[PDB]
Amino acid sequence: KKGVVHGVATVAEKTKEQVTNVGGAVVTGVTAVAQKTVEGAGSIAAATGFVKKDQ
Amino acid sequence: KKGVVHGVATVAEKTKEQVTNVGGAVVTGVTAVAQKTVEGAGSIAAATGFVKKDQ
Amino acid sequence: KKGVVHGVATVAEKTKEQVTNVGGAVVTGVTAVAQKTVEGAGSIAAATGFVKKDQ
Amino acid sequence: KKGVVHGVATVAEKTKEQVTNVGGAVVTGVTAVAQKTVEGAGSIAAATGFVKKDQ
Amino acid sequence: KKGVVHGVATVAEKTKEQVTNVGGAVVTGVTAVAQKTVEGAGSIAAATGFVKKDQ
Amino acid sequence: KKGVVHGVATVAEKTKEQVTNVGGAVVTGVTAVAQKTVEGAGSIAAATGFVKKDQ
Amino acid sequence: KKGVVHGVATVAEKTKEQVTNVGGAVVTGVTAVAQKTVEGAGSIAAATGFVKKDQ
Amino acid sequence: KKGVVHGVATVAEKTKEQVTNVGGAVVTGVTAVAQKTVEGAGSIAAATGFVKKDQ
Amino acid sequence: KKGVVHGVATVAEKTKEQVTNVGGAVVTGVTAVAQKTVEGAGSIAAATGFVKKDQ
Amino acid sequence: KKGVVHGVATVAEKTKEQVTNVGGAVVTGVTAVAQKTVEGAGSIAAATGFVKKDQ
Ligand SMILES: Cc1cc(-c2ccc(/N=N/c3ccc4c(S(=O)(=O)O)cc(S(=O)(=O)O)c(N)c4c3O)c(C)c2)ccc1/N=N/c1ccc2c(S(=O)(=O)O)cc(S(=O)(=O)O)c(N)c2c1O
Ligand SMILES: Cc1cc(-c2ccc(/N=N/c3ccc4c(S(=O)(=O)O)cc(S(=O)(=O)O)c(N)c4c3O)c(C)c2)ccc1/N=N/c1ccc2c(S(=O)(=O)O)cc(S(=O)(=O)O)c(N)c2c1O
Numbered sequence A, B, C, D, E, F, G, H, I, J: 001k002k003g004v005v006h007g008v009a010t011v012a013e014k015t016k017e018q019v020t021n022v023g024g025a026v027v028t029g030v031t032a033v034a035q036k037t038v039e040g041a042g043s044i045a046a047a048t049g050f051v052k053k054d055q
């Protein structure tokens, strides 16, 4: 076989899960957050996949 | 077989899940948030997939 | 087989779920948010798939 | 076989999971956060995959 | 076979899991955080994969 | 002060919430159920406060 | 002060929450259930407060 | 002070939370269940407070 | 002071939390369950407070 | 002071937490379970407080 990509690719066979991202956010997984009190200014309480590039 | 992509592709066979994103947000997964009190200015309480690029 | 894409594609066979996004938001998954009090100015309380690019 | 990529690629066969990211965040895994009180200004309470590049 | 990449690639066969990242965050693994009280200003309580490059 | 009860009482001062039950069911709290498919004969899918005393 | 009860009482002062139960079920708390598929005959999927006394 | 109870009592002062139960179930706490597939006959998937006295 | 109980009592002062139970189940605490697949016949997957007295 | 109990009592002063149980189950504590696959017939996967007296 032959393949040429510029990116971003994701090429496969017999594949149970696939995610391609440029951005941005993708949530595909099981996630449970239980929480009782959030205070403070300002605290990232429960972050799973996170990116902060403030300018 | 032969394939040429510019991106972003996602090419496959026999594949249970697929996500392609440029952006942007995609939520395809099970997610449960239970929460009782959020305060503060300003706190990211429960973030799963998150991207902040303020300018 | 043969395939040429410019992107963004999502090409497959025998595939249970598919999402293609450029944007933008796509919500296809099970999601439960239970919440009791949100305060503060301004706090992202419960974000699942999120993108903030304010200029 | 033959392959030429510019990146970022992810090329495979017989592959159970795949993630390609440029960004950005991708959450595909099981995650449980249970939490009772978050205070302080400002404390990253529970971070799993995290990136902070404030300027 | 032949392959030329610019990076970042991830090329394989018969491969159960794959992650490619430039960024950014990717969470694909099982993760359980149980927590009772977070205080202080400001303390990284429970960080799994973490990167802080404040300027 | 003086108090004599037979039960079931609930006596208080300065009290934000109160529930008295003999029965029976009382639902006063925030509750979110999101659900996609229920099958089987017969499975209690998502029960929060539950009592089964079949004879 | 003086108090005589037969039960079940709940006597207090300056008290934020109160529940008295004989039964029966009382749900006063924040609860989030997100769920995608329930099968089997018969499986208690997600039970929070539960009592089964079949005869 | 003086107190005589038969039970079940719960007597207090300056008390943030109170639960009295004979039964029966009481759910007053924050609870998040996220779940993707339940099978089998019959498996208690996620039980928090649970009592089974089948005869 | 003087007190005579038959049980079950719970007598206190200046007390943040109280639970009295005869039964039965009481859930007052923060709880997060994230789960991806439950199979088998029949397996207690995730039990927190649990009592099984089948006859 | 004077006290006579039959049991089960729990008598105190200046006390942050209290639990009295006859039964039965009480869950008051922070608990996080993250889980990816449960199989087998039948395996107690993750048990925190547990009692099995099958007859
Ligand atoms: C036990 C056993 C199993 C198999 C076997 C099982 C499954 C299977 N393919 N399954 C598929 C497939 C596809 C699915 C697809 S798709 O077609 O890709 O689209 C989709 C989807 S879905 O997304 O819609 O959910 C699926 N669910 C698919 C799926 O489930 C296959 C192929 C095979 C095979 C063998 C097997 N057991 N073999 C032996 C063989 C020998 C055994 C021997 S002996 O000494 O050799 O006589 C003895 C003993 S004993 O001492 O313990 O009694 C045994 N137990 C022996 C034994 O068990
Ligand atoms: C037990 C056993 C199973 C199979 C087997 C099972 C499934 C299967 N394909 N399943 C598919 C497929 C497709 C689905 C598709 S699609 O077509 O892709 O669109 C879609 C969808 S859906 O999205 O609509 O849900 C699906 N659900 C699909 C799906 O479920 C296949 C192919 C096979 C095979 C074998 C098998 N057991 N074999 C043996 C073989 C031998 C055994 C032996 S022996 O020593 O060899 O005599 C002994 C013993 S014993 O000692 O334990 O009694 C055994 N148990 C033995 C035994 O079990």
Ligand SMILES: Cc1cc(-c2ccc(/N=N/c3ccc4c(S(=O)(=O)O)cc(S(=O)(=O)O)c(N)c4c3O)c(C)c2)ccc1/N=N/c1ccc2c(S(=O)(=O)O)cc(S(=O)(=O)O)c(N)c2c1O
Pocket (backbone or CB within 6 Å): none
């Ligand atoms: C148990 C067993 C099963 C199969 C098997 C099962 C399913 C199947 N295909 N299923 C499909 C398919 C398609 C669906 C499609 S579609 O067509 O793709 O559009 C759509 C949809 S939907 O979206 O509308 O829901 C579906 N639901 C589809 C679906 O469900 C297939 C293909 C197969 C096969 C074998 C099998 N068991 N085989 C053996 C084989 C041997 C066994 C042996 S022996 O030693 O070899 O004699 C012994 C023993 S024992 O000791 O335990 O008694 C056994 N149990 C043995 C045994 O079980």
Ligand SMILES: Cc1cc(-c2ccc(/N=N/c3ccc4c(S(=O)(=O)O)cc(S(=O)(=O)O)c(N)c4c3O)c(C)c2)ccc1/N=N/c1ccc2c(S(=O)(=O)O)cc(S(=O)(=O)O)c(N)c2c1O
Pocket (backbone or CB within 6 Å): F014
């Ligand atoms: C900072 C500070 C606060 C207090 C204080 C605060 C609150 C308060 N009572 N609050 C209540 C009450 C009731 C509510 C009721 S109810 O009436 O029960 O029905 C209901 C409800 S509601 O259900 O409707 O929501 C409420 N929300 C109620 C409520 O909020 C009270 C009583 C007090 C007190 C003091 C205080 N700070 N004192 C000092 C004292 C000294 C300080 C000193 S010094 O060395 O001693 O000079 C220095 C410094 S510095 O170096 O940091 O500048 C300080 N910061 C100092 C300082 O902060």
Ligand SMILES: Cc1cc(-c2ccc(/N=N/c3ccc4c(S(=O)(=O)O)cc(S(=O)(=O)O)c(N)c4c3O)c(C)c2)ccc1/N=N/c1ccc2c(S(=O)(=O)O)cc(S(=O)(=O)O)c(N)c2c1O
Pocket (backbone or CB within 6 Å): G014, H014, H016
């Ligand atoms: C820092 C400091 C604090 C206190 C203090 C703080 C709180 C307080 N009572 N709080 C209550 C109370 C009730 C609440 C109630 S209720 O009334 O029971 O219903 C309800 C509820 S609620 O359920 O509605 O949420 C509440 N939230 C209640 C609550 O918050 C009290 C009583 C006190 C006291 C002192 C204090 N600091 N003292 C000193 C004292 C000296 C210090 C000295 S010195 O050498 O002695 O000059 C030096 C220095 S320095 O070198 O670091 O600058 C200091 N920092 C010094 C200092 O900090």
Ligand SMILES: Cc1cc(-c2ccc(/N=N/c3ccc4c(S(=O)(=O)O)cc(S(=O)(=O)O)c(N)c4c3O)c(C)c2)ccc1/N=N/c1ccc2c(S(=O)(=O)O)cc(S(=O)(=O)O)c(N)c2c1O
Pocket (backbone or CB within 6 Å): F014, G014, G016
């Ligand atoms: C900082 C400080 C605080 C207090 C203080 C704070 C709170 C308070 N009572 N709060 C209550 C109460 C009731 C609430 C009620 S209820 O009335 O029970 O119904 C209800 C409810 S609600 O359910 O509706 O939400 C509430 N929220 C209630 C509540 O919040 C009280 C009583 C006190 C007290 C002192 C205090 N700080 N003192 C000092 C004292 C000295 C300090 C000194 S010095 O060396 O001694 O000069 C130095 C320094 S420095 O070096 O750091 O500048 C200090 N910081 C010093 C200092 O901080």
